């Protein structure tokens, strides 16, 4: 037959089949399990710091791996490096390229990388013989402005981009070795697993794929949201992962059971989440909202435990360090915050 | 502070002049002309707008000693809405409109002419949420091609509830107000409109022009007099 | 990475001299600079320090009113104005660079230095053991001490390890008395508990032989101890 008319219908039967196997697999929900456990008190957090001196917007930062350096990214053309602990601006490096949309800190403090709006990812060197930051690596092979950058190693990075691709590169070389294909609409995040083996990421057609960075290819796919997906996040032991979307919903997915776990929303939230956050012992999850203010969730019993105000607009970035001592947020009006 | 050790006094100064330098670089920022250059598909932006002086492109030009950035956004082909919010401090935002398309059919679709889903384009633009306070340039480009073109084919093909003399000026002043009626605002935001085709300056000029009476009236309503 | 130094010469007692160093491979003006003194077959004499930025300056008791330090952002020169002198001041200039932001580590390159030969509270820092007879292959101790101590509230230590090789310049080894420099073996290694320090070396070779000092950087005035010349 010249024409595809039975290889159409083949895709219809194969995804019921995948269906009526998660049903299958649903023995109770989490509720019913984490019910007779003591519910958490009352969170409240201080505003500990305020580091000001960014101009404009701010978009994206990260914790370094010693809990006490970060960068933070802005609208007007600038990287700063701070010191959480005694407020001090360690560096300032100037872009070429205003639009930035993301910003990472290499696991070993060396390395700094930058993009947005540009299709180009920027590597900074920051030890350096001649005392100064410089542009080393520029890699350049998206059609699409990119969203986010997560270092592997020394030598290695992943990044996606609004061209519904995400590429692992070579910074010795700066070509793409690798590149996953198959998401519908531009991909908005991605996060890298505690063992570095595999990283998920999520696309404005409401989905999330798990990868494998050694091979190369699409493994599980994740649905339920209903709008785009703007945060992705990894819990702690690398068996789950959170996902923040534009309905004004989270989510938890486990990748062991592929299954729907728990929701996170509340009446009176109407605008989308910005950011996604973990805790360390995974009991509290952090999420960032339009609404110009941040809220703590209870992630065991859904239950809301707490809710971080003190920012003027869009609560935009948010990470925790990697002992947990405290957490940051930015916003549209150019402040961060330290709370603990 | 009185209790910090000897190499904590010059961090403390190393920070002060990172401050020091990021506030000076600062100010030299707000002293220069952001426009976000929008148009239509074959609009004759690139031919004229873009030529008017010597991923996203970015184009310097200094008129008058007025410093202006044009950011050209055509190549980008993504989705508009997730990057749309990164210009929402711009000065003003100029429109490129090819008038000589009300007889051409667009390239994909038959049903309709190039006209229509331009101005479809201007009122999604214009009445954005972010954009409420905007004022917006519009340029109406190639007009020696519109009147040799009206005096065989008629208005009428392109609107057919218009009823006028089918000359140049009738036909133009009808399209330039059908497209200044699409403004829903009329309180917070002015639409300027100027006739380009190809003519020897008197484009920078009414940039600067239309620039200047923005900032005028976004003083006067900072400085509490509205 | 150069600094290259200019100006010496004998000068009869009383009169003036100018000295200065050109910094040619780096960016001169986010570094703070400093004078270190070295008189014939004696140990180092921290001279002054400016700041980047021409900020705080800094000066030793025996040349404060006498000497002057001036910095030349545009060309990246380091002067060093020299009032009237004395038989006293016959010895060896250096110049050396430092930066301080969290993690850095001051006192990377020594420069060369000039002769200048002239015509004719403080924290003690005490060291021992001016010679000591060495073997390849083997492994032998340093030991430096001191009078305060140099832990700070914060929990840093500042003691740092210097090695001058026979007819060469100092050149840092280990800072803050726990990390090791860049560009140096494995070898080295440094410990200590709040006054009493100790340096490790292991597996000499005939590139390791010189004089190795011990200085403190606590507070100003920064005080250099004596020296152990390792001998073959």
């Known amino acids: 037959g010249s024409e595809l008319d039975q290889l159409r219908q083949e895709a219809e039967q194969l995804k019921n089949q995948i269906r009526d196997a998660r049903k299958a697999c649903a023995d109770a929900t989490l509720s019913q399990i984490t019910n007779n456990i003591d519910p958490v008190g009352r969170i409240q957090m201080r505003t500990r710091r305020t580091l000001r001196g960014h101009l404009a917007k701010i978009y994206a930062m990260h914790w370094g791996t010693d809990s006490r350096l970060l960068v933070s990214a802005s609208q007007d053309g600038k990287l700063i490096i701070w010191d959480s602990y005694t407020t001090n601006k360690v560096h300032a490096i100037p872009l070429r390229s205003s639009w930035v949309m993301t910003c990472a800190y290499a696991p070993s403090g060396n390395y700094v990388a930058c993009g947005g709006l540009d299709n180009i990812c920027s590597i900074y060197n920051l030890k350096t013989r001649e005392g100064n930051v410089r542009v080393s690596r520029e890699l350049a092979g998206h059609t699409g402005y990119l969203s986010c950058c997560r270092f592997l190693d020394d030598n290695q990075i992943v990044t996606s981009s609004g061209d519904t691709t995400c590429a692992l590169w070579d910074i010795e070389t700066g070509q793409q070795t690798t590149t996953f294909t198959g998401h519908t609409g531009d991909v908005m995040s991605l996060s890298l697993a505690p063992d570095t083996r595999l990283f998920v990421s999520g696309a404005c057609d409401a989905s999330a794929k798990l990868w494998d960075v050694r091979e190369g290819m699409c493994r599980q796919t994740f649905t339920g949201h209903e709008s785009d997906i703007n945060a992705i996040c990894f819990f702690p032991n690398g068996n789950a992962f959170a996902t923040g979307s534009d309905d004004a919903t989270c989510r938890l997915f486990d990748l062991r059971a592929d299954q729907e776990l728990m929701t996170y929303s509340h009446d009176n939230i109407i605008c989308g989440i910005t950011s996604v956050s973990f805790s360390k012992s995974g009991r509290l999850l952090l999420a960032g909202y339009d609404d110009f203010n941040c809220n703590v969730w209870d992630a065991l019993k859904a239950d809301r435990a707490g809710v971080l105000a003190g920012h003027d607009n869009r609560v935009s970035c948010l990470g925790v360090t990697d002992d947990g001592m405290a957490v940051a947020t930015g916003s549209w009006d150019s402040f961060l915050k330290i709370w603990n | 502070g009185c209790t910090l050790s000897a190499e904590d006094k010059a961090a403390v100064e190393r920070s002060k002049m990172i401050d020091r330098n990021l506030r000076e670089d600062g100010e030299k920022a707000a002293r220069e002309v952001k426009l976000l250059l929008l148009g239509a598909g074959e609009s004759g932006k690139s031919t004229i707008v873009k030529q008017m002086k010597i991923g996203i492109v970015e184009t310097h030009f200094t008129f008058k000693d007025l410093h202006f950035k044009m950011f050209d956004v055509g190549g980008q082909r993504s989705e508009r809405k997730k990057w749309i919010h990164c210009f929402e401090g711009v000065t003003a935002i100029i429109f490129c409109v090819a008038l000589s398309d009300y007889d051409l059919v667009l390239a994909e679709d038959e049903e309709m002419n190039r006209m229509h889903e331009s101005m479809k384009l201007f009122d999604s633009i214009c009445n954005n949420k972010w954009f409420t306070d905007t004022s917006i340039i519009l340029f109406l480009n190639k007009k020696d091609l519109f009147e040799e073109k009206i005096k065989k084919s008629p208005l009428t093909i392109c609107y057919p509830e218009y009823a006028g003399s089918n000359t140049y000026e009738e036909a133009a002043a009808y399209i330039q107000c059908q497209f200044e009626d699409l403004n829903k605002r009329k309180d917070t935001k002015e639409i300027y409109t100027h006739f380009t085709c190809a003519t020897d300056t008197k484009n920078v000029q009414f940039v600067f022009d239309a620039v200047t009476d923005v900032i005028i009236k976004n003083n006067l309503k900072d400085c509490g007099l509205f | 990475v150069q600094l290259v130094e200019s100006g010496g010469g004998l000068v009869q007692p009383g009169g003036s001299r100018k000295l200065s160093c050109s910094a040619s491979?780096?960016?001169?003006?986010?570094?703070?600079m400093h004078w270190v003194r070295q008189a014939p077959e004696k140990g180092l004499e921290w001279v002054a320090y400016?700041?980047?930025?021409?900020?705080?300056?800094y000066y030793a008791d025996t040349v404060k009113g006498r000497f002057t330090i001036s910095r030349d952002d545009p060309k990246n020169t380091l002067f060093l104005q020299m009032t009237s002198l004395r038989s006293e001041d016959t010895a060896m200039y250096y110049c050396?660079?430092?930066?301080?932001?969290?993690?850095?580590?001051?006192?990377?390159?020594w420069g060369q230095g000039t002769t200048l030969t002239v015509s004719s509270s403080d924290i003690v820092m005490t060291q021992a053991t001016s010679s000591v007879p060495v073997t390849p292959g083997e492994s032998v101790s340093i030991s430096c001490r001191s009078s305060?101590?140099?832990?700070?509230?914060?929990?840093?230590?500042?003691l740092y390890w210097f090695l001058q090789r026979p007819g060469q310049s100092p050149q840092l080894l280990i800072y803050?008395?726990?990390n090791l420099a860049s560009g140096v073996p494995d070898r080295f290694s440094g410990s200590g508990s709040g006054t009493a320090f100790t340096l490790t070396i292991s597996r000499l070779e005939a590139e390791d032989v010189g004089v190795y000092y011990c200085?403190?950087?606590?507070?100003?005035?920064?005080?250099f101890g004596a020296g152990t010349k390792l001998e073959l």
């Open positions: 050396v660079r430092s930066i301080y932001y969290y993690g850095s580590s001051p006192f990377d390159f």
């Open positions: 491979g780096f960016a001169f003006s986010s570094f703070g």
């Open positions: 400016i700041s980047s930025g021409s900020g705080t300056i």
């Open positions: 305060k101590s140099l832990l700070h509230s914060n929990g840093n230590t500042y």
């Open positions: 803050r008395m726990s």
């Open positions: 200085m403190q950087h606590l507070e100003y005035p920064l005080t």
